Amino acid sequence: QYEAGVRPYRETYYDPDYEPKDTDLLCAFRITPKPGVPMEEAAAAVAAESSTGTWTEVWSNLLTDLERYKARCYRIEGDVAYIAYPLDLFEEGSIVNIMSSIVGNVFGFKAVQALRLEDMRIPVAYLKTFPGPPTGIQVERDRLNKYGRPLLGGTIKPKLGLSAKEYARVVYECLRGGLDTTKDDENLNSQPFNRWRDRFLYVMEAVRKAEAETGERKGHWLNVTAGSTEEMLKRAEFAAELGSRYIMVDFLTAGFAAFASVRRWARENGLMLHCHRAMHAVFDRQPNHGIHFRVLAKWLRMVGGDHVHTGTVVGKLEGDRAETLGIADLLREDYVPADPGRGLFFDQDWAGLKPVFPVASGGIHVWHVPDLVSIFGDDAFFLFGGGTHGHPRGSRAGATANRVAVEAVVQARNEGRDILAEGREILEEAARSCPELREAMELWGDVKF
Amino acid sequence: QYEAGVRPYRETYYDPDYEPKDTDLLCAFRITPKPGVPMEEAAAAVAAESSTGTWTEVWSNLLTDLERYKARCYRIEGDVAYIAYPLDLFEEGSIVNIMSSIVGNVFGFKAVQALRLEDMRIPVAYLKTFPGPPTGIQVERDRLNKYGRPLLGGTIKPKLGLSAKEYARVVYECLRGGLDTTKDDENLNSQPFNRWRDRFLYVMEAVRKAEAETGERKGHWLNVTAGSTEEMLKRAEFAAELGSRYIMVDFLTAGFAAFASVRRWARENGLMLHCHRAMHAVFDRQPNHGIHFRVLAKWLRMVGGDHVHTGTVVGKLEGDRAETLGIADLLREDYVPADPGRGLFFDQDWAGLKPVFPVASGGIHVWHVPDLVSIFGDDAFFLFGGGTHGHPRGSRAGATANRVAVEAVVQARNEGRDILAEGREILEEAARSCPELREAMELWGDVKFEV
Amino acid sequence: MHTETFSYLPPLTDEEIKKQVEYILKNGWIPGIEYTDEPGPHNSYWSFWKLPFFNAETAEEVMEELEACREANPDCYIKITGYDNIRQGQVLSFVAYRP
Amino acid sequence: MHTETFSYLPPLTDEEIKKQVEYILKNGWIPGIEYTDEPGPHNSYWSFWKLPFFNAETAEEVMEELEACREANPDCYIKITGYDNIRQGQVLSFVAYRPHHHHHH
Amino acid sequence: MHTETFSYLPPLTDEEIKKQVEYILKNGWIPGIEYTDEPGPHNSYWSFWKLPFFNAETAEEVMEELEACREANPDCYIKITGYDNIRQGQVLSFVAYRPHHH
Amino acid sequence: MHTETFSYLPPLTDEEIKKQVEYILKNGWIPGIEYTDEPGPHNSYWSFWKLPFFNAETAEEVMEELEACREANPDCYIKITGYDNIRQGQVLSFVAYRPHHHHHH
């Protein structure tokens, strides 16, 4: 009663006359076919095996409306295949479902030897099924009462190995010296040398003490990342009982289903949510295979994180300046037009979702502050871990150096100075009044990446 | 008061004199340094930045004992750096914590242009803080009353688009034709055209009807994968209320913390846990950068999935024979010696954790059955989705063809026949008593994938 | 035992059954045949006679299959179905033969 | 009524059965015989025909017991079991005899 | 008592303050002046000096209001604000005058 | 206001203090100095007088810093700390200086 047998995927799943609907989810896939497999067939294989198809015709295809439901490759430019997915294919509010289709099996086919998801056009009708950040940039600045400059943070070091009590000594010195926030390392969860309950308690003593002493609101990104969702929610609950303004989650290692659970809990309990992108470079770094960070950044903004790391460009971890500028816009703006020169393949409307703070962290020190202010502007966190505790006089002095550097560069920008052309002179001028900053500049004056 | 400033990572974190302890977690990383960065410095950067270190010396290093806590690269051989991580660094029972250290930041450093985690030795002292599978191969066979052959399953197709009622019709036809199980596609969760509660109800009616009609116990891997942990647990709950033997989770797309939540739920409720590895190839496809599936497979067995997909070798998705044999041993055996020819850089003791069923799925059909029985032996599921519903006479006939193929090959193996040399002949012999099998052999005889 | 649509009318003649099949085909729907010896309200999945007739072009082809199903299963209730793949739903179902 | 392993193949001849018993014995597993008139999915415990044949040394001894069981219980399904005490689990079970009515519905 | 943005720099001169007012105006933001004798972290709502200066066109206008606020409230902390109605958020806030008892 | 270890003994002389510092150093622990005007049970973090003396080699060096701290902060309680980085914990802490008002209530 039907035509059984194997057909090329392109017969059903390649349609170069298809016009994408404003409700379709669009993917830009970088395809490296197995040699001898044409682009059109490789693209159709990806479109088929991420939507409705499989490797041979099935009688049950005729019990549904594949014309309505199938994904289809509708355009190919070079090695980039554009595939359109009907809105009805997706579970509302579920990044987990997006991934299970779009990146579920199609990266492992023999016919397609490498595959990278470069960008995705999330349609407004699908975006509205997501709640976005639980706080968002504007409300977070209101909660902190901080306006007009990048915010200062810093990872406590050594990454692991400090007792809970001594850990919060470092926090206290940093916050009292002028950092706005400090954070647990992504891999500091609850371990034999530092269990999370003790750390949460002592850190909040330190946060409260620094807030009272300086008069500025403080916070610490208490890492709730744990082996199970229930454990993360219990840690978040205790952070809330202690009056922490923040918790933190490693959203990729905990994973998107638990991340969604934490976002809901954070919103309902008045906590702001720092998101660490641990694991991202396992699959977003190489240009031939994986998922570009700008896609991860879109998904992050949808579930709802209040901040996510974006790289520094100039620090110890790899970053591309043009890509980073586009990602910053994707995280912060209401609407981002396509721009091939930043790898933004699609226009992205954000459907009124709240914006996310970019976070620049990793191997940075005072000499980087002119470049960082130039790249990110005010709505970012700059984190100095090593660049704080590695100060010759320790963490309080390091925090002061870093806070002064940011403020001096912001002041100079606002006065109309060229902070790139005059960056060194701006810092030297501020160091004339700030020995902490002079010592930091001397220590790290030869350290570049 | 301390020596501030930047030092090479190798000063603290490269120690070729270090003797790994039986309690250390060991990693084998294939490293491609930035040109001009020595291997020793690149390996030391990975060790430092996945344990205790950062880019400049900090006063607070002197408040702890880096000799106790630092990871250290203790051997570099070719392009592989061996790195030892002290037991103390890890949170008991947390795969999430393992990932946050071992693969957290170290794949994105300027100094290390590509990095491939090939293998990890999980020490017994840490492994036994994990529970392993809630069921295990032997208990599952007892629950199903199925002994002495591979088990048959298959994904319902089209992946998406069937109503709940017609989805369950396909299930019914498959199960009553001789498949042991059927499953939801990994991307079938709850959608406008097929909402999960409707599917779960109708599918279990089909399962019960097929079991009563055939006399054989059946199951369907109901996919509980959802956008939040709470929603996944709600779906698991309903499957339990309907008396399903099984639930299914996409453990990597849902993620390990939600997976662990479902595994605890599964222990409290007695359902078996099918684990789909959707997204794994995003991480594991390329040989220069990423995480090899064998590592993910270890993590899977530690949390406690009862099955995981391992690849087919011969079907539509990539999978090399040697690596797949290594992965099957890692999933099933109590102790697995190293063999770098299979990518096993370390020996792995499982210290009594239960074995996981390998699941071979994707682009396979009747002609693959001799090779599949040769590769996996009895203790595997073979799934035919397209290879069942794409039969000329539909899903019941397709299921029968696949079931007969497996049984004929098993019978022949047990009689002493060489199922590789005689595999095609054994299928031809069986097809003389089974027209469904003949029709399947004829339809797909020219359909081959490279191996 | 009532059998849902048309069960409250007199048993359909072959001519009357054919007209319903013609209606299924005229609307572009897929005709099918199912049968069972347990037609009660517990039973959601009667036995398929072959597959749904995706390729059928004429009502006469369907009536030949009905007669063949009747001859193989004279102790069963036999129903004609019509399936609309655009709504993913059965759009007409009635019993054509009672044992 | 399908009866699990080999149920989808033609009913086994005595020579085919004996080869399966030889497979059990050659791997050091324990052959056994069980029977029932209620073979469906709710029945996990068929009736023992004697205890498992712990001391069986040849397939012939087992075939002689199968013959005795099927003469004593011609109205029953009769299965051969193959038990591995090392893993505490059955490694092969299959029906060797089905009653007359099975093939005449 | 630190006072958030620019608090870690030397207290601003009138000329430095005016440059920051010029930056607010150049960007099309709304300058404002607020004051309090309780500047600590519990206080989210300083007293407005008049309304935000929606109609201000020059920095000298704002500087005159700052001086007027200080003369009337010499015991208070006085801050300059800049508001962006398109983001619905404050975009710059810094203390321009601290009382003698600071 | 009791101040934990040795608080129930007579206030320590400088020679008694130095012997305790010698005990810290001889066991390879890190001496430090901290001070506060709020010594009670809600205060876990007194103010550092410089960082812990990681590089101190003699008790005399530590006594010179104690003298400097008590001259700079005569209104504060001042404690000697003794930190063991091998266990990540203080192994001895005691007050070496109390302000005048302590002894006159």
Ligand SMILES: O=C(O)[C@@](O)(COP(=O)(O)O)[C@H](O)[C@H](O)COP(=O)(O)O
């Ligand atoms: O573990 C680390 O290396 C860090 O704490 C930085 O420490 P330092 O401040 O001492 O360099 C951050 O987690 C990285 O910046 C994350 O990388 P990214 O921001 O690119 O996600």
Ligand SMILES: O=C(O)[C@@](O)(COP(=O)(O)O)[C@H](O)[C@H](O)COP(=O)(O)O
């Ligand atoms: O979506 C699919 O393609 C499948 O349902 C197979 O359908 P077919 O049976 O019709 O091929 C399975 O999910 C893949 O086999 C998983 O790949 P793996 O097992 O390698 O993780």
Ligand SMILES: [Mg+2]
């Ligand atoms: Mg970190």
Ligand SMILES: [Mg+2]
């Ligand atoms: Mg699938």
